[PDB]
Write a protein that binds this ligand. Structure first.
Ligand SMILES: Nc1ncnc2c1ncn2[C@@H]1O[C@H](COP(=O)(O)OP(=O)(O)OP(=O)(O)O)[C@@H](O)[C@H]1O
Ligand SMILES: Nc1ncnc2c1ncn2[C@@H]1O[C@H](COP(=O)(O)OP(=O)(O)O)[C@@H](O)[C@H]1O
Ligand SMILES: Nc1ncnc2c1ncn2[C@@H]1O[C@H](COP(=O)(O)OP(=O)(O)O)[C@@H](O)[C@H]1O
Ligand SMILES: [Mg+2]
Ligand SMILES: [Mg+2]
Lengths: 468, 99, 48, 464, 49, 49, 469
């Protein structure tokens, strides 16, 4: 009844089974690599039924050392991971194996990682602001409790630092459960996060699932599903509020595209798999709060080559309630967090949810920044003296506003030595109202760089000789 | 097409119908996925050779009928999401030419 | 008067710059479409 | 000897035939869809001979409901459209089926839509000008008899009225006929054009051929050939001057590109069909003057991304002879037709063709209008008073010239009581020469709106 | 190539020939069409190598 | 990978290693050449998936 | 017997079926016969691939027009070989070693296979001896290396061939060693002009010329470089004689390789190039190299398609060079000859260790001034020079004078302008550009610096214009 390996080509393995014993799609099969240096048990996932009792499968582990014709065993079910309160405080890989305690969790209940999304009738839109203490996020991209939040950006613009900052700000005081999913990111970052959570004593409430960029495409494709399965158990079964952090969700799509052509799929535009949107929707529609069951999800989304029109981020955009879009231009200016205020968005940034004052101040800030962006090239070529008095005043205000949107972040201390700060939402709204009214135009713009609230502004202005 | 059929039932019965498609670019992406998975030859942006037909036959069902057929009408409001305000992309160009 | 002449010259130079840039941008647009099609068709042929 | 459907892949259908009965390329085959909801007769155009007595064909109608193995009949000829005087005043699809009266024209003579251009020795080696009677076109951008004219214009600038005017003029001043080819025709706009031509009473002089937007690419690709076949019959058999309209030629090119993609052919630069130039040439080289009779074609051209170097417009313009830009600004002035005298152009506006005096007058008019356009911004912002007296008089002269470029069209009678006017080319040239010289500045501006020659100018002068 | 061969016949007989190609852009386009119809992989601007 | 293995032998035995790859662009080009010669389906810029 | 037969013909590429055990080795030469009247000839096919079933895919050196399926194909048992020795000097050969200026010559010479491995890595030694050409821009900003590898990049018609002629005049003329010129896919009339010019200058007696030009099948255009390089290798490794190797154009070798790869059925790489582009280029280039005690100064003109310097061909060629002169369309448009882009060109020996401290300082100051001018072009294209600061205005005037003074009346430019060329000693070049960078000639008009040699020419031209130096 067992199958045998017929073709091996990178992470894709063709397996022939006796007629009537062909495994179902997404079933987990087991093969053996007996070579001493690389001896292991490969988990393959059935991807396609090629016909003639052949199945195309994706290896979860490197196929180096695999031999043609070796026995392949069908487990009869999909990949399944342990679920329950025992996952909290531990590190797992995509297959449910505990890393910091091998063998732990083997006796837990195991849930299949493949699952349909919640029924549409159980979906309730979430409109409740989740305060963070970050000026730019709270003012322009207010996050939603139980909603879907994303941090878009190119390589090395501050997505991981921002995720760590939000773990510090949100998860530390969180009363429920946290799940972190490292998807195709740096192993060193995973170790740093593990140690930092242990230090903050947040780890006991956190389940960490890692599949890193050194893993084959299959692991990077299924790690997000594993972590989401744990989070789904905590949501549906345990009935508790869940935080879900994913970094980086683009790696799921990228891993899908890596094996797409080896599966016989004709490429789509920009070298992506034809089923980009379908797989992304299958994964994302599970990352949601249902009626009375809350998942506040925060996802880092890599934007390939800073191109926000790339198919992957463009498809991802529709699945989010709030989006903080980090910019390489803002980054290179030195502003941190390198948020693009004109590009970021939030579905609860309207007067009904945040109130008239907050909405008006945010809109005025956006208008000033848009006008400054329009005038930037004029200033570059013809100089600022050829602007009108109103335009010059607007430019001064806009420069101060953009500096004040930057903040000394708690997780950025290792990069600046400066301890971080938290600004209450009321103070943020008041300070930016004052800025838009021109009440701080007498201070040097350098006074507004990487500070907290108004008291920090006054102190830094004093250090620079100005008075507030 | 499901929405268009539901609306067409009313339109042919003398009613006036407004149909919003949000968005047709997602339909085009789904059809491209299907066509690629069926190995039909691709063109610009990997779209099959009949994506323009996909959208045109849908949108031409929005019509103002003559008094002989009851005077019913269906008004179409297709929605297209451009990227970087690129209206010269394939699907935006098609739908702009169609409407 | 000299500022009028200088600004007329600058506006004409901006006309020329915009025309050249639009030509280059259209060439880049066509090249990108052609290259995307080349990649798509090459992948499809590899699977033929 | 009938074939049978083997493969169905969207609009592409493979048909197997007995060894000795494989149809010729471009032959029109017939198949039947018998499912009640979608029952119809498919027309298939043989595109390729795949071997083993299989032919790859493009379906002219949606293949939904087609079944493998259904009998396929070969007509023995390519797509044939009805021809004769009977096609006037009626609407046909790309296959020659009447839309306003199904079954009409079945008994007329039928011509294959695939025909070769006139032999090399039968072409006319001397270019000729088509005198329309419109001042702006005749003077600034003279039309070429048997040539090609691009038409550019946004919505609501009198494009439809201009087409009606050209239909009137070809029918009345040449004893000719018009064929309208709606390539990618919006059904709403097709019905609007039908009704408007009927109301204007010029539908009797025109034959409409619609390949509509909701049709598969094959009919959109062949509708231009169908209309051109009707026009060729009028030119060759009836000995008439024809005026063929194509809207939009870019949609003919795009339908060809889509057909090429469906047939699995590798796309060319910018994704167009490899044979883009060949198809464009095959279409355009049939629009020519032969043995004293001509088909003149006005063609609406869409320029992708406004890029005139794009392969589609670049290929189309290689065949065009003149350009007529309809301007929103000109239309908003009340000037009709809303032809942009500065954006428009013509390749035969040179001394060797139109003579020295026509060139001289046209160039003087162009210079005056260009100067006025340059001064327009100063006028608008800093005011006319700022301009010098020389500039003020030049502005008055240019305003009078641009008003006189307007004309009371024959298509305007249905909108205004006065009938249209025809202006002989010599009279137009002399009148505009005098206007440029400054022999009518003393007359008021309003005297120059919507009139014909110098006699109308004089009469409106006394009237005011 | 036809024009070139006709001219070459005279040239190799001591004659002086002037050959005009109007224009080679369209010959390149035709050759590219033939190559693509042969399914030869294209290069810059879809032209054959 | 050879250099990485040599460095890893020292790294796993308590030594500190510094490895310079000069440069990975050419390794990527060589891998693309190998993959194309094996006729594996290419991706962006003909590189393998 | 043991001869194969032609089974497939696809242009220059031919598939040949051999009896089992007689399949020729890779790169072996095989002979076929075309018997049709006007095209009758003997085809030389180089084995390129083993297809299995005793089939070999081969690249034809001559056009295959008239070839028939099933004709006998004979295996020479070895690869293409070319004559070597002192006898090749003064004669013109084709890719296969046939003498063109005197058919039959060199058939009795020692013959070397055109395929061989590059020198062992242990025999390689870096070369850093400066080669003084007398051109201001080259000597200052891109000093050439004696025994190193020099390249001249440039789009269509920017002056690559004229600069190759200039360097033949300036280096090969009074050269004690041997010279090898390899025309690779260039104009045939250019080859004839070079032949006649070398004969007139008496340099031909020391030069070996090998031509595979534009109207050749891609196989010949990709093997002619190997043939000429084999003659150069013989002179380097057997007679211990300093060798000059001029190649024009090596991009044509890459282009022919791309055409062959397309015909061979290989899956295309980016921009339609062969997957083995970098590998083929490296295999060719690593053979062009000096070894310990054996010097080859090679100078290669590299064509840049569509002025695109990021095209894969030149992009991969860049890594194989010690000195790289980049000719620019913009500089050419300004009328500056040689149309060298001083900011994109480079030399491995332009460091204070090799060229001295003052040479390096002057070169770096010139580069800095030109870079600042390049930066300011964006402002200047719109507003002109008058909106800049006084420092920037002074720098821009200095930069315009410097860029004009980098031009020179070349020896090979006389045929075009009628003006004899000039040679500038390196010390004078350094002194003059030091003076320019310090603003000692700012008062002279710009045109005083255009197409001249040293400071004496500068004085004469300035006086003729009206300014006194
Ligand atoms: N130093 C120079 N002085 C004057 N004119 C020159 C000079 N160098 C080049 N030219 C002009 O440029 C033309 C092209 O020169 P050259 O043939 O050397 O260019 P190229 O880069 O080798 O061109 P191609 O890409 O056609 O092979 C020369 O015929 C001559 O007209
Ligand atoms: N708030 C900040 N303050 C100072 N430096 C920062 C800040 N955020 C990011 N950086 C710098 O940018 C780098 C990239 O951040 P990270 O989020 O790790 O990359 P990515 O955005 O690709 O995830 C960091 O290593 C850090 O040096
Ligand atoms: N010669 C004319 N005289 C009077 N009115 C005109 C004339 N030409 C156009 N118009 C008016 O301008 C409008 C333009 O509409 P139409 O001609 O249908 O162009 P389009 O179809 O592009 O909108 C018409 O409604 C018509 O009333
Ligand atoms: Mg990161
Ligand atoms: Mg040259």
């Amino acid at each position: 009844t067992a199958g045998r390996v017929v073709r091996i080509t990178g992470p894709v393995v063709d397996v022939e089974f006796p007629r009537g014993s062909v495994p179902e799609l997404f079933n987990a099969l087991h093969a053996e690599i007996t070579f001493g240096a690389l001896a292991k048990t490969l988990t393959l996932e059935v991807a396609q039924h090629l016909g003639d009792s052949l199945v195309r499968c994706i290896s979860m582990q490197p196929t180096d050392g695999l031999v043609r014709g070796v026995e392949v065993t069908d487990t009869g079910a999909s990949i399944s991971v342990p679920v329950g309160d025992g996952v909290k405080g531990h590190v797992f890989n995509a297959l449910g194996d505990c890393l910091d305690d091998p063998g732990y969790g083997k006796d837990f209940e195991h849930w299949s990682i493949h699952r349909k999304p919640p029924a549409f009738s159980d979906l309730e839109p979430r409109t409740e602001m989740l305060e963070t203490g970050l000026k730019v996020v709270d003012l322009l991209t207010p996050y939603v409790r139980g909603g879907k939040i994303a941090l878009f950006g190119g390589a090395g613009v501050g997505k991981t630092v921002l995720i760590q900052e939000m773990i510090n700000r949100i998860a530390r005081n969180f009363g429920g459960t946290s799940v972190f999913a490292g998807v195709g990111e740096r192993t060193r970052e995973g170790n740093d996060l593990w140690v930092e959570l242990a230090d903050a004593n947040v780890l006991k409430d956190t389940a960490l699932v890692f599949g890193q960029m050194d893993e084959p495409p299959g692991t990077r494709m299924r790690v997000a599903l594993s972590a989401l399965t744990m989070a789904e158990f905590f949501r549906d079964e345990q009935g508790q509020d869940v935080l879900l952090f994913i970094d980086n969700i683009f790696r799921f799509t990228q891993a899908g595209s890596e094996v797409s052509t080896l599966l016989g799929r004709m490429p789509s535009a920009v070298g992506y798999q034809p089923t980009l949107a379908d797989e992304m929707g299958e994964l994302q529609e599970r990352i949601t709060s249902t009626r009375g069951r809350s998942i506040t999800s925060m996802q880092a989304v890599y934007v390939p080559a800073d191109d926000y029109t790339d198919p992957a981020p463009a498809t991802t955009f529709a699945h989010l309630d709030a989006t903080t879009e980090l910019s390489r231009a803002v980054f290179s200016k030195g502003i941190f967090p390198a948020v693009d205020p004109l590009a970021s968005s939030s579905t609860i940034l309207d007067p009904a949810i945040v109130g008239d004052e907050h909405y008006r101040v945010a809109q005025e800030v956006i208008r000033i920044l848009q006008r400054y962006k329009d005038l930037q090239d004029i200033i570059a070529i013809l100089g600022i003296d050829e602007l009108s008095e109103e335009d010059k005043q607007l430019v001064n205000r806009a420069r101060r506003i953009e500096r004040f949107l930057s903040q000394n972040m708690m997780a950025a201390e290792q990069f600046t030595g400066q301890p971080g700060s938290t600004v209450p939402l009321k103070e943020t709204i008041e300070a930016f109202d004052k800025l838009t009214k021109g009440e701080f135009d007498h201070l040097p713009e350098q006074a507004f760089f990487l500070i907290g609230g108004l008291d920090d502004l006054a102190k830094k202005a004093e250090s620079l000789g100005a008075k507030l | 097409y499901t929405g268009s059929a539901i609306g067409q039932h009313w339109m042919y019965n003398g009613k006036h119908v407004l149909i919003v498609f949000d968005d047709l670019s997602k339909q085009a992406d789904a059809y491209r996925a299907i066509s690629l998975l069926l190995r039909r030859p691709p063109g610009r942006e990997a779209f099959p050779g009949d994506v323009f037909y996909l959208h045109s036959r849908l949108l031409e069902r929005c019509a103002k009928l003559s008094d002989e057929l009851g005077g019913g009408s269906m008004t179409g409001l297709p929605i297209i999401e451009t990227k970087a305000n690129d209206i010269s992309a394939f699907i935006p160009t098609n739908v702009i030419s169609i409407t | 008067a000299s500022r009028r002449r200088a600004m007329k010259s600058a506006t004409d130079n901006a006309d020329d710059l915009i025309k050249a840039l639009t030509l280059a941008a259209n060439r880049e647009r066509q090249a990108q479409i052609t290259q995307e099609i080349s990649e798509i068709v090459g992948g499809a042929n590899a699977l033929a």
